Enzyme design. Structure first.
Site, mmCIF file in Angstrom:
data_model
loop_
_atom_site.group_PDB
_atom_site.id
_atom_site.type_symbol
_atom_site.label_atom_id
_atom_site.label_comp_id
_atom_site.label_asym_id
_atom_site.label_seq_id
_atom_site.Cartn_x
_atom_site.Cartn_y
_atom_site.Cartn_z
ATOM 1 N N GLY A 237 0.456 -1.139 0.006
ATOM 2 C CA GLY A 237 -0.097 -0.414 -0.220
ATOM 3 C C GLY A 237 1.409 1.282 -0.169
ATOM 4 N N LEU B 293 -5.317 -1.147 6.218
ATOM 5 C CA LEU B 293 -3.737 -1.198 6.432
ATOM 6 C C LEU B 293 -2.832 -2.815 6.414
ATOM 7 C CD1 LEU B 293 -3.803 1.879 8.341
ATOM 8 C CD2 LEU B 293 -3.391 0.900 6.124
ATOM 9 N N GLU B 294 -1.955 -2.629 5.842
ATOM 10 C CA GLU B 294 -1.361 -3.841 6.256
ATOM 11 C C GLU B 294 -0.794 -3.866 7.375
ATOM 12 O OE1 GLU B 294 2.595 -4.317 2.822
ATOM 13 O OE2 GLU B 294 1.352 -1.953 2.404
ATOM 14 N N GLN B 295 0.313 -5.389 8.116
ATOM 15 C CA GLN B 295 0.779 -4.847 9.582
ATOM 16 C C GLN B 295 1.791 -3.866 9.235
ATOM 17 O OE1 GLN B 295 2.590 -8.728 8.244
ATOM 18 N NE2 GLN B 295 1.919 -9.608 9.928
#
Ligand code: CA
Ligand code: NA
Ligand code: NA
Length: 323
Positions: free
Chosen positions: A101, A133-135
């Protein structure tokens, strides 16, 4: 100057079947079991999906304000497809984040980000934003505070003109614990968010410890899938067993469409989900609905070229009452 896409559909009295829609073109053999996701136009999303999340609004790794632009279709034609969903009471959200992202806002970007979200709404007719959201992005830059701040400015803006701008989140379920980075998204947005759909896929052997049955119940354990889903929901509803509190009326099960859409977490029998819905409703805490990654996977094909034929929405649409 209003058209069909100018409306912000009301989902406040409905259970949802939420599907992510890939805005990019399929690359082939993109599945976890070497299947191929479909290139489906947004307007052709199956009717059982009453919320569609357009994926993704994202950064570029250079500048700070995320943005979105459809691929291979002009702005007025894309908006018309959003209008067509809107006319039937179906909400279309813009999903923020995704893998790779590059979402990384900094303090002071809240107003410019809010302005960009408002330009998306005015340009394409979106009805809300989904935080996905990605980690790495959860605590990147000042995301934790800027994203909530911007979203409140947007909700307030539309509330002034009579409209309900939807705010949803799709966190990976292990992050929804006390003292977690993610907790601050929930508490900052406690009066603003419409529902939270924890991703109950791709987390391997993470899960929940259950005193009642004396077992670790893992998300990748198919023998115990019924218990997993029930106890995960119960844990969120009560804020027990290590998990934050989400009200059931704002809780959505996040499930993968099929075995190509995720590495783990596919539910092999839909009766399992119906039993959990039934049990929760009998206790007076029915949930808001079901979410899936992804419409494109639901309409895709396995590695042998056998079509999935919307098998996920055909099975779960009727459970949440969109079909
Ligand atoms: Ca709209
Ligand atoms: Na409601
Ligand atoms: Na209601």
């Amino acid at each position: 100057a209003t058209d069909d896409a100018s409306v912000m559909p009301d989902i406040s009295n409905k259970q949802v079947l939420v599907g992510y829609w890939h805005s990019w073109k399929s690359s082939g053999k993109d599945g976890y079991q070497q299947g191929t996701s479909a290139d489906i136009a947004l307007k052709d999303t199956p009717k059982a999906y009453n919320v569609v999340d357009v994926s993704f609004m994202k950064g570029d790794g250079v500048n700070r304000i995320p943005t979105f632009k459809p691929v291979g279709i002009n702005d007025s034609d894309f908006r018309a497809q959003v209008g067509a969903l809107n006319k039937e009471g179906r909400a279309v959200l813009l999903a923020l984040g995704g893998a790779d992202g590059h979402v990384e806002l900094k303090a002071g970007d809240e107003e410019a980000f809010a302005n960009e979200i408002i330009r998306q709404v005015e340009t394409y007719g979106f009805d809300g934003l989904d935080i996905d959201l990605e980690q790495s992005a959860i605590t990147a830059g000042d995301n934790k505070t800027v994203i909530p701040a911007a979203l409140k400015i947007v909700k307030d803006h539309y509330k002034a003109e009579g409209k309900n701008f939807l705010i949803t989140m799709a966190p990976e379920f292990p992050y929804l614990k006390p003292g977690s980075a993610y907790e601050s998204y929930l508490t900052s947005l406690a009066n603003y968010y419409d529902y939270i759909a924890p991703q109950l896929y791709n987390q391997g052997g993470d899960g929940v410890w259950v005193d009642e049955t004396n077992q670790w119940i893992a998300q990748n354990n198919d023998t115990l899938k019924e218990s997993f889903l029930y106890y995960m929901a119960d844990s969120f509803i009560n804020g027990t067993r290590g998990y934050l509190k989400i009200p059931a009326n704002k809780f959505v099960f996040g499930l993968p469409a099929n075995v190509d859409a995720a590495a783990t977490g596919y539910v092999t029998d839909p009766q399992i989900v119906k039993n959990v819905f039934t049990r929760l409703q009998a206790k007076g805490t029915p949930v808001k609905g079901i979410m899936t990654w992804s419409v494109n996977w639901d309409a895709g094909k396995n590695k042998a070229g056998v079509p999935y034929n919307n098998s996920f929405s055909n099975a779960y649409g009727p459970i949440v009452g969109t079909k």
